[PDB]
Design a binder for this molecule. Structure first.
Ligand SMILES: Nc1ncnc2c1c(-c1cnc3[nH]ccc3c1)nn2C1CCCC1
Ligand SMILES: [Ca+2]
Ligand SMILES: [Cl-]
Length: 433
């Protein structure tokens, strides 16, 4: 006997799936992935539902101010998104204290601008929870209600929970390999050598992006290999691989990033009013993605702003990764002269990418042809520092551009530095007595 409750209003797009609203409760019949067979209680109909739209009744996630599986940096990114003001808060699972919680509040001090402060949450005895040992609480709800009524030792009082967005709907069940007939490629987005990229529609609803491949050099059954491999590498900073069309020419169906490529975005009009901290935030998201790739020991072989895509909410993801196991200004000398290409050469690439982002999509090594570049690189030449670039960010680029491959940093260290670029290590969690 398992009863859940819906967190957002949902509409049926498939045939055997249910429809509900924010607040309606449902019985659970089957657990099998992101889709659960469930019986509604208001309609009493039995349909399939997205498992990330519901949560077990009165089990924390039911509350508006609780956010599961969110990191400290992520909570910082969300609380500064449009729709949030001073005091906009949230409670999340602790990232450094597994089995504990943390409170994140939006504040403003004049000498830095808008900020997000994080307080730890202690829990034992067990009489309840506390942030300051003087004021103790039984449940997290009453705890919230106290600090909501006057800032008892905080840099700001609590106003409203974070402006949570409705999650992206999960892919259709059993729909890995799909009939091509399900597609309506209604706009060409890009074309180049090996294939095209279209904005498409999968069955009337659900927008989608399709990459069509003109065959030849790329084989046939040598593609269900890389497909089934990259399908196992799910990540929030990598572009999601949804479906793949069986018959040749093979179609690759992925999520549709609403604002195209990063290079197009930076060169664009909106992506030029984007301040420096947001660019650093972008490169931190990319670093996070390259760090996940690094943990899995894989290589990208082609890293640049053109291969980074942007969602409508300014989220960066990584596109056709590993398609070099399936154009040199971003390439390290070890991979140019000797064809090395490792995770370290990708660190070099990330250095040039970092150069693109800061220069609003400018061409690396401007005024230089590829020969003029390669001849100068052996001469020990590195790109100068832009007039709007911090010396510390420049030092990161320089570290990425070491002659020795293994003297270069890791994407784990690069991400960490970039994530807390404006925050001293001691300032991460403000501790109040
Ligand atoms: N997913 C997308 N969403 C929105 N726009 C996209 C894309 C892609 C794209 C990039 N890499 C991909 N690899 C497999 C599918 C796939 C699709 N390419 N593009 C266009 C290509 C250049 C600017 C935008
Ligand atoms: Ca502190
Ligand atoms: Cl029942």
């Amino acid at each position: 006997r398992i009863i859940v409750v819906a967190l957002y209003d949902y509409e049926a797009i498939h045939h055997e799936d249910l429809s509900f609203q924010k607040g309606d409760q449902m019985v659970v019949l089957e657990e099998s992935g992101e889709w659960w067979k469930a019986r509604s209680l208001a309609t009493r109909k039995e349909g399939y539902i997205p498992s990330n739209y519901v949560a077990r009744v009165d089990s924390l996630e039911t509350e508006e101010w609780f956010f599961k599986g969110i990191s400290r940096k992520d909570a910082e990114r969300q609380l500064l998104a449009p729709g949030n003001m001073l005091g906009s808060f949230m409670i999340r699972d602790s990232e450094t204290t597994k089995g504990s919680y943390s409170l994140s509040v939006r504040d403003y001090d004049p000498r830095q601008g808008d900020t997000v402060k994080h307080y730890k949450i202690r829990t034992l005895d067990n009489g309840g929870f506390y942030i300051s040992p003087r004021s103790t609480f039984s449940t997290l709800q009453e705890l919230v209600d106290h600090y909501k009524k006057g800032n008892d030792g905080l840099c700001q009082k609590l106003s409203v929970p974070c402006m949570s967005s409705k999650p992206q709907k999960p892919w259709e069940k059993d729909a890995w390999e799909i009939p091509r007939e399900s597609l309506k490629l209604e706009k060409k987005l890009g074309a180049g050598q090996f294939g095209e990229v279209w904005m498409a529609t999968y069955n009337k609803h659900t927008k989608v992006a399709v990459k069509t491949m003109k065959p030849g050099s790329m084989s046939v059954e040598a593609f269900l290999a890389e497909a089934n491999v990259m399908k196992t590498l799910q990540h929030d900073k990598l572009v999601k691989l949804h479906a793949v069309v069986t018959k040749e020419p093979i179609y690759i169906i992925t999520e549709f990033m609403a604002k195209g490529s990063l290079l197009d975005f930076l060169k664009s009009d909106e992506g030029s009013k984007q301040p420096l901290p947001k660019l650093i935030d972008f490169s931190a998201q990319i670093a996070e993605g390259m760090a996940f790739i690094e943990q899995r020991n894989y290589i990208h072989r082609d890293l640049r702003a053109a291969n980074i895509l942007v969602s409508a909410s300014l989220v960066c993801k990584i596109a056709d990764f590993g398609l070099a196991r399936v154009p040199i200004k971003w390439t390290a000398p070890e991979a140019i002269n000797f064809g090395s290409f490792t995770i370290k050469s990708d660190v070099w690439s990330f250095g040039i990418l970092l150069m693109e982002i800061v220069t609003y999509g400018r061409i690396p090594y401007p005024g230089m042809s590829n020969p003029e570049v390669i001849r100068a690189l052996e001469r020990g030449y590195r790109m100068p520092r832009p007039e709007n670039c911090p010396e510390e960010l420049y030092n990161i680029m320089m570290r990425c551009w070491k002659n020795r491959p293994e003297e270069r940093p890791t994407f784990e260290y690069i991400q960490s530095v970039l994530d807390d670029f404006y925050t001293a290590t001691e300032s991460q969690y403000e501790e109040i007595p």
